[PDB]
Every structure is written in C-alpha cells, then in structure tokens.
mmCIF file of all heavy atoms in Angstrom:
data_model
loop_
_atom_site.group_PDB
_atom_site.id
_atom_site.type_symbol
_atom_site.label_atom_id
_atom_site.label_comp_id
_atom_site.label_asym_id
_atom_site.label_seq_id
_atom_site.Cartn_x
_atom_site.Cartn_y
_atom_site.Cartn_z
ATOM 1 N N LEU A 24 -28.240 -75.988 -19.045
ATOM 2 C CA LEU A 24 -27.182 -76.316 -18.100
ATOM 3 C C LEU A 24 -26.072 -75.287 -18.201
ATOM 4 O O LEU A 24 -25.692 -74.871 -19.299
ATOM 5 C CB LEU A 24 -26.624 -77.726 -18.363
ATOM 6 C CG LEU A 24 -25.268 -78.094 -17.757
ATOM 7 C CD1 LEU A 24 -25.294 -78.003 -16.235
ATOM 8 C CD2 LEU A 24 -24.856 -79.488 -18.196
ATOM 9 N N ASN A 25 -25.549 -74.879 -17.042
ATOM 10 C CA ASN A 25 -24.437 -73.940 -16.956
ATOM 11 C C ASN A 25 -23.563 -74.354 -15.780
ATOM 12 O O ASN A 25 -23.890 -74.051 -14.626
ATOM 13 C CB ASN A 25 -24.937 -72.509 -16.776
ATOM 14 C CG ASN A 25 -25.825 -72.055 -17.911
ATOM 15 O OD1 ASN A 25 -25.377 -71.396 -18.850
ATOM 16 N ND2 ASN A 25 -27.106 -72.402 -17.830
ATOM 17 N N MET A 26 -22.458 -75.040 -16.057
ATOM 18 C CA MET A 26 -21.540 -75.483 -15.016
ATOM 19 C C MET A 26 -20.414 -74.469 -14.901
ATOM 20 O O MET A 26 -20.014 -73.860 -15.898
ATOM 21 C CB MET A 26 -20.990 -76.878 -15.310
ATOM 22 C CG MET A 26 -19.987 -76.985 -16.454
ATOM 23 S SD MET A 26 -18.934 -78.430 -16.211
ATOM 24 C CE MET A 26 -18.111 -78.572 -17.795
ATOM 25 N N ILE A 27 -19.902 -74.292 -13.685
ATOM 26 C CA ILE A 27 -18.892 -73.281 -13.403
ATOM 27 C C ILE A 27 -17.661 -73.969 -12.825
ATOM 28 O O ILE A 27 -16.982 -73.427 -11.949
ATOM 29 C CB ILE A 27 -19.435 -72.198 -12.447
ATOM 30 C CG1 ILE A 27 -20.717 -71.585 -13.029
ATOM 31 C CG2 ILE A 27 -18.394 -71.105 -12.216
ATOM 32 C CD1 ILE A 27 -21.990 -72.281 -12.595
ATOM 33 N N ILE A 28 -17.382 -75.188 -13.293
ATOM 34 C CA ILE A 28 -16.232 -75.939 -12.795
ATOM 35 C C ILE A 28 -14.971 -75.105 -12.998
ATOM 36 O O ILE A 28 -14.607 -74.762 -14.129
ATOM 37 C CB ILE A 28 -16.120 -77.320 -13.470
ATOM 38 C CG1 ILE A 28 -15.934 -77.198 -14.988
ATOM 39 C CG2 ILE A 28 -17.352 -78.157 -13.153
ATOM 40 C CD1 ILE A 28 -15.581 -78.507 -15.668
ATOM 41 N N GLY A 29 -14.321 -74.744 -11.893
ATOM 42 C CA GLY A 29 -13.119 -73.967 -11.948
ATOM 43 C C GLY A 29 -11.877 -74.811 -11.740
ATOM 44 O O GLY A 29 -11.946 -76.034 -11.557
ATOM 45 N N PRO A 30 -10.709 -74.155 -11.764
ATOM 46 C CA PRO A 30 -9.449 -74.892 -11.601
ATOM 47 C C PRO A 30 -9.126 -75.191 -10.143
ATOM 48 O O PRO A 30 -9.917 -74.890 -9.246
ATOM 49 C CB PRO A 30 -8.404 -73.942 -12.213
ATOM 50 C CG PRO A 30 -9.187 -72.779 -12.800
ATOM 51 C CD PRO A 30 -10.471 -72.733 -12.055
ATOM 52 N N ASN A 31 -7.963 -75.790 -9.910
ATOM 53 C CA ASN A 31 -7.437 -76.019 -8.574
ATOM 54 C C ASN A 31 -6.491 -74.887 -8.196
ATOM 55 O O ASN A 31 -6.117 -74.057 -9.032
ATOM 56 C CB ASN A 31 -6.715 -77.367 -8.488
ATOM 57 C CG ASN A 31 -7.674 -78.539 -8.426
ATOM 58 O OD1 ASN A 31 -7.991 -79.042 -7.348
ATOM 59 N ND2 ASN A 31 -8.142 -78.978 -9.593
ATOM 60 N N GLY A 32 -6.102 -74.854 -6.924
ATOM 61 C CA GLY A 32 -5.305 -73.752 -6.432
ATOM 62 C C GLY A 32 -6.144 -72.498 -6.326
ATOM 63 O O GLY A 32 -6.937 -72.349 -5.393
ATOM 64 N N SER A 33 -5.979 -71.583 -7.279
ATOM 65 C CA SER A 33 -6.869 -70.432 -7.417
ATOM 66 C C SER A 33 -8.195 -70.888 -8.034
ATOM 67 O O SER A 33 -8.510 -70.617 -9.191
ATOM 68 C CB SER A 33 -6.203 -69.344 -8.253
ATOM 69 O OG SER A 33 -7.022 -68.192 -8.330
ATOM 70 N N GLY A 34 -8.979 -71.595 -7.223
ATOM 71 C CA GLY A 34 -10.104 -72.353 -7.729
ATOM 72 C C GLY A 34 -11.478 -71.746 -7.536
ATOM 73 O O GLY A 34 -11.760 -70.646 -8.023
ATOM 74 N N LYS A 35 -12.343 -72.464 -6.820
ATOM 75 C CA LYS A 35 -13.779 -72.220 -6.846
ATOM 76 C C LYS A 35 -14.456 -72.226 -5.484
ATOM 77 O O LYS A 35 -15.653 -71.915 -5.416
ATOM 78 C CB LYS A 35 -14.466 -73.282 -7.724
ATOM 79 C CG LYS A 35 -14.389 -74.683 -7.123
ATOM 80 C CD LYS A 35 -14.943 -75.743 -8.055
ATOM 81 C CE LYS A 35 -13.919 -76.117 -9.115
ATOM 82 N NZ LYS A 35 -12.865 -77.022 -8.589
ATOM 83 N N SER A 36 -13.750 -72.567 -4.406
ATOM 84 C CA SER A 36 -14.398 -72.806 -3.118
ATOM 85 C C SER A 36 -15.232 -71.629 -2.631
ATOM 86 O O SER A 36 -16.318 -71.849 -2.083
ATOM 87 C CB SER A 36 -13.343 -73.150 -2.064
ATOM 88 O OG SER A 36 -12.521 -72.037 -1.782
ATOM 89 N N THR A 37 -14.765 -70.395 -2.813
ATOM 90 C CA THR A 37 -15.463 -69.217 -2.303
ATOM 91 C C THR A 37 -16.585 -68.747 -3.212
ATOM 92 O O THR A 37 -17.341 -67.847 -2.828
ATOM 93 C CB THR A 37 -14.470 -68.071 -2.084
ATOM 94 O OG1 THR A 37 -13.618 -67.945 -3.230
ATOM 95 C CG2 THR A 37 -13.622 -68.323 -0.847
ATOM 96 N N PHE A 38 -16.719 -69.323 -4.412
ATOM 97 C CA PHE A 38 -17.766 -68.893 -5.332
ATOM 98 C C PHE A 38 -19.103 -69.576 -5.060
ATOM 99 O O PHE A 38 -20.129 -69.129 -5.585
ATOM 100 C CB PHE A 38 -17.328 -69.156 -6.774
ATOM 101 C CG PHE A 38 -18.393 -68.878 -7.793
ATOM 102 C CD1 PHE A 38 -18.942 -67.612 -7.910
ATOM 103 C CD2 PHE A 38 -18.855 -69.887 -8.624
ATOM 104 C CE1 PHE A 38 -19.925 -67.355 -8.843
ATOM 105 C CE2 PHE A 38 -19.838 -69.632 -9.559
ATOM 106 C CZ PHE A 38 -20.376 -68.366 -9.670
ATOM 107 N N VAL A 39 -19.117 -70.632 -4.248
ATOM 108 C CA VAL A 39 -20.351 -71.384 -4.026
ATOM 109 C C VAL A 39 -21.417 -70.498 -3.399
ATOM 110 O O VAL A 39 -22.618 -70.684 -3.627
ATOM 111 C CB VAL A 39 -20.067 -72.624 -3.155
ATOM 112 C CG1 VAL A 39 -19.007 -73.501 -3.804
ATOM 113 C CG2 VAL A 39 -19.641 -72.209 -1.755
ATOM 114 N N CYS A 40 -20.997 -69.511 -2.606
ATOM 115 C CA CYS A 40 -21.913 -68.662 -1.856
ATOM 116 C C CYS A 40 -22.417 -67.467 -2.663
ATOM 117 O O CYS A 40 -23.216 -66.680 -2.150
ATOM 118 C CB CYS A 40 -21.230 -68.181 -0.575
ATOM 119 S SG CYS A 40 -22.269 -67.199 0.532
ATOM 120 N N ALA A 41 -21.972 -67.321 -3.914
ATOM 121 C CA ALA A 41 -22.345 -66.147 -4.698
ATOM 122 C C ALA A 41 -23.837 -66.086 -4.995
ATOM 123 O O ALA A 41 -24.335 -65.021 -5.364
ATOM 124 C CB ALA A 41 -21.560 -66.131 -6.012
ATOM 125 N N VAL A 42 -24.561 -67.199 -4.836
ATOM 126 C CA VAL A 42 -25.978 -67.216 -5.186
ATOM 127 C C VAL A 42 -26.883 -67.105 -3.966
ATOM 128 O O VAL A 42 -28.114 -67.119 -4.113
ATOM 129 C CB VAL A 42 -26.333 -68.495 -5.963
ATOM 130 C CG1 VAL A 42 -25.508 -68.586 -7.239
ATOM 131 C CG2 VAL A 42 -26.133 -69.733 -5.097
ATOM 132 N N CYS A 43 -26.322 -66.987 -2.761
ATOM 133 C CA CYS A 43 -27.151 -66.988 -1.560
ATOM 134 C C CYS A 43 -27.850 -65.647 -1.366
ATOM 135 O O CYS A 43 -29.084 -65.581 -1.328
ATOM 136 C CB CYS A 43 -26.298 -67.330 -0.337
ATOM 137 S SG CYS A 43 -25.376 -65.926 0.338
ATOM 138 N N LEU A 44 -27.078 -64.565 -1.238
ATOM 139 C CA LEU A 44 -27.655 -63.271 -0.904
ATOM 140 C C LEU A 44 -28.573 -62.730 -1.992
ATOM 141 O O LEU A 44 -29.384 -61.843 -1.700
ATOM 142 C CB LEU A 44 -26.547 -62.259 -0.610
ATOM 143 C CG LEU A 44 -26.954 -61.064 0.255
ATOM 144 C CD1 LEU A 44 -27.465 -61.511 1.618
ATOM 145 C CD2 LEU A 44 -25.798 -60.095 0.408
ATOM 146 N N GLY A 45 -28.464 -63.221 -3.226
ATOM 147 C CA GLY A 45 -29.439 -62.862 -4.239
ATOM 148 C C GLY A 45 -30.852 -63.253 -3.873
ATOM 149 O O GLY A 45 -31.792 -62.508 -4.170
ATOM 150 N N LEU A 46 -31.019 -64.403 -3.230
ATOM 151 C CA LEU A 46 -32.289 -64.830 -2.663
ATOM 152 C C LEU A 46 -32.482 -64.322 -1.241
ATOM 153 O O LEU A 46 -33.527 -64.583 -0.639
ATOM 154 C CB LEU A 46 -32.370 -66.363 -2.711
ATOM 155 C CG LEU A 46 -33.658 -67.104 -2.319
ATOM 156 C CD1 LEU A 46 -33.731 -68.405 -3.101
ATOM 157 C CD2 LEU A 46 -33.734 -67.413 -0.825
ATOM 158 N N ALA A 47 -31.513 -63.570 -0.707
ATOM 159 C CA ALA A 47 -31.514 -63.139 0.687
ATOM 160 C C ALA A 47 -31.235 -64.320 1.611
ATOM 161 O O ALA A 47 -31.672 -64.354 2.764
ATOM 162 C CB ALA A 47 -32.824 -62.444 1.061
ATOM 163 N N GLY A 48 -30.503 -65.301 1.097
ATOM 164 C CA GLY A 48 -30.107 -66.433 1.920
ATOM 165 C C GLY A 48 -29.145 -66.008 3.007
ATOM 166 O O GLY A 48 -28.336 -65.091 2.838
ATOM 167 N N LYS A 49 -29.233 -66.684 4.151
ATOM 168 C CA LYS A 49 -28.412 -66.350 5.303
ATOM 169 C C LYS A 49 -27.129 -67.174 5.268
ATOM 170 O O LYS A 49 -27.203 -68.415 5.271
ATOM 171 C CB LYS A 49 -29.161 -66.616 6.597
ATOM 172 C CG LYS A 49 -30.566 -66.033 6.637
ATOM 173 C CD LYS A 49 -30.547 -64.540 6.923
ATOM 174 C CE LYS A 49 -31.939 -63.939 6.823
ATOM 175 N NZ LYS A 49 -31.971 -62.520 7.282
ATOM 176 N N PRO A 50 -25.942 -66.556 5.233
ATOM 177 C CA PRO A 50 -24.707 -67.358 5.218
ATOM 178 C C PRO A 50 -24.543 -68.238 6.440
ATOM 179 O O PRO A 50 -23.827 -69.242 6.369
ATOM 180 C CB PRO A 50 -23.597 -66.298 5.137
ATOM 181 C CG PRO A 50 -24.224 -65.022 5.558
ATOM 182 C CD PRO A 50 -25.668 -65.110 5.194
ATOM 183 N N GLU A 51 -25.182 -67.895 7.564
ATOM 184 C CA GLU A 51 -25.103 -68.739 8.745
ATOM 185 C C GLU A 51 -25.650 -70.137 8.485
ATOM 186 O O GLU A 51 -25.279 -71.078 9.187
ATOM 187 C CB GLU A 51 -25.866 -68.094 9.904
ATOM 188 C CG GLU A 51 -25.244 -66.802 10.423
ATOM 189 C CD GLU A 51 -25.625 -65.588 9.597
ATOM 190 O OE1 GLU A 51 -26.429 -65.732 8.652
ATOM 191 O OE2 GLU A 51 -25.123 -64.485 9.896
ATOM 192 N N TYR A 52 -26.523 -70.289 7.485
ATOM 193 C CA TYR A 52 -27.086 -71.591 7.160
ATOM 194 C C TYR A 52 -26.149 -72.454 6.325
ATOM 195 O O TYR A 52 -26.360 -73.663 6.236
ATOM 196 C CB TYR A 52 -28.409 -71.414 6.411
ATOM 197 C CG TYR A 52 -29.196 -72.689 6.220
ATOM 198 C CD1 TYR A 52 -29.661 -73.412 7.308
ATOM 199 C CD2 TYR A 52 -29.468 -73.172 4.949
ATOM 200 C CE1 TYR A 52 -30.378 -74.581 7.136
ATOM 201 C CE2 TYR A 52 -30.183 -74.343 4.764
ATOM 202 C CZ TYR A 52 -30.636 -75.040 5.861
ATOM 203 O OH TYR A 52 -31.349 -76.204 5.684
ATOM 204 N N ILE A 53 -25.119 -71.858 5.719
ATOM 205 C CA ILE A 53 -24.175 -72.602 4.889
ATOM 206 C C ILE A 53 -22.775 -72.466 5.480
ATOM 207 O O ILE A 53 -21.926 -73.352 5.310
ATOM 208 C CB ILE A 53 -24.214 -72.111 3.431
ATOM 209 C CG1 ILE A 53 -23.949 -70.604 3.364
ATOM 210 C CG2 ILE A 53 -25.559 -72.448 2.803
ATOM 211 C CD1 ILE A 53 -23.890 -70.054 1.959
ATOM 212 N N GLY A 54 -22.528 -71.360 6.178
ATOM 213 C CA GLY A 54 -21.304 -71.186 6.934
ATOM 214 C C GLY A 54 -20.014 -71.246 6.147
ATOM 215 O O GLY A 54 -19.045 -71.841 6.626
ATOM 216 N N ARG A 55 -19.962 -70.649 4.954
ATOM 217 C CA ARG A 55 -18.680 -70.521 4.268
ATOM 218 C C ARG A 55 -17.819 -69.442 4.919
ATOM 219 O O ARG A 55 -16.594 -69.598 5.018
ATOM 220 C CB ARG A 55 -18.895 -70.212 2.788
ATOM 221 C CG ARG A 55 -17.615 -70.198 1.953
ATOM 222 C CD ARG A 55 -16.930 -71.557 1.936
ATOM 223 N NE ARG A 55 -15.725 -71.552 1.115
ATOM 224 C CZ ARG A 55 -14.546 -71.092 1.512
ATOM 225 N NH1 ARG A 55 -14.374 -70.580 2.719
ATOM 226 N NH2 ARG A 55 -13.515 -71.143 0.676
ATOM 227 N N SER A 56 -18.441 -68.351 5.360
ATOM 228 C CA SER A 56 -17.762 -67.325 6.139
ATOM 229 C C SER A 56 -18.576 -67.094 7.404
ATOM 230 O O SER A 56 -19.779 -67.365 7.445
ATOM 231 C CB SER A 56 -17.595 -66.026 5.349
ATOM 232 O OG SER A 56 -16.709 -65.139 6.006
ATOM 233 N N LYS A 57 -17.904 -66.590 8.439
ATOM 234 C CA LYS A 57 -18.512 -66.503 9.758
ATOM 235 C C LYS A 57 -19.754 -65.623 9.796
ATOM 236 O O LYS A 57 -20.663 -65.908 10.591
ATOM 237 C CB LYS A 57 -17.491 -65.979 10.774
ATOM 238 C CG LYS A 57 -17.787 -66.406 12.204
ATOM 239 C CD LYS A 57 -16.513 -66.653 12.992
ATOM 240 C CE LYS A 57 -16.829 -67.157 14.395
ATOM 241 N NZ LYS A 57 -15.603 -67.582 15.126
ATOM 242 N N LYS A 58 -19.835 -64.579 8.978
ATOM 243 C CA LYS A 58 -21.006 -63.706 8.998
ATOM 244 C C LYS A 58 -21.177 -63.063 7.629
ATOM 245 O O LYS A 58 -20.251 -63.023 6.817
ATOM 246 C CB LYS A 58 -20.894 -62.644 10.092
ATOM 247 C CG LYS A 58 -19.687 -61.725 9.961
ATOM 248 C CD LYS A 58 -19.805 -60.532 10.899
ATOM 249 C CE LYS A 58 -18.452 -59.899 11.178
ATOM 250 N NZ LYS A 58 -17.925 -59.162 9.997
ATOM 251 N N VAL A 59 -22.387 -62.550 7.395
ATOM 252 C CA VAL A 59 -22.699 -61.919 6.113
ATOM 253 C C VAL A 59 -21.865 -60.665 5.912
ATOM 254 O O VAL A 59 -21.388 -60.399 4.801
ATOM 255 C CB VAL A 59 -24.209 -61.612 6.025
ATOM 256 C CG1 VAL A 59 -24.610 -60.560 7.048
ATOM 257 C CG2 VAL A 59 -24.576 -61.165 4.611
#
C-alpha cells in the first residue's frame, strides 16, 4: 500500500491525473484539464 494523502489548500487535486499518461490514458476520459 502507498497512499499519497496530501494537505488542504496547496493540496492534491491536480495530482490524481499523474498516472494517466503513463498508461497512455486520455485526459478527456477523466477531464481534470480540458486537453492533454
């Protein structure tokens, strides 16, 4: 197990997508940002 629970404010919301493009995942399927 490896949890990456971050703080609030300067937190964690934008880190969720860090594992997508490693698999060649398309951000359009998760939509954190408008385009890759």
Side-chain angles (χ1 to χ4, degrees):
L24 163 60
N25 301 263
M26 72 155 168
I27 305 91
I28 61 170
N31 284 263
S33 183
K35 67 186 80 77
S36 68
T37 46
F38 174 60
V39 303
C40 184
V42 301
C43 82
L44 203 60
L46 187 151
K49 311 281 174 172
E51 293 82 3
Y52 189 62
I53 56 177
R55 186 63 179 80
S56 192
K57 205 145 183 172
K58 60 168 159 72
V59 66

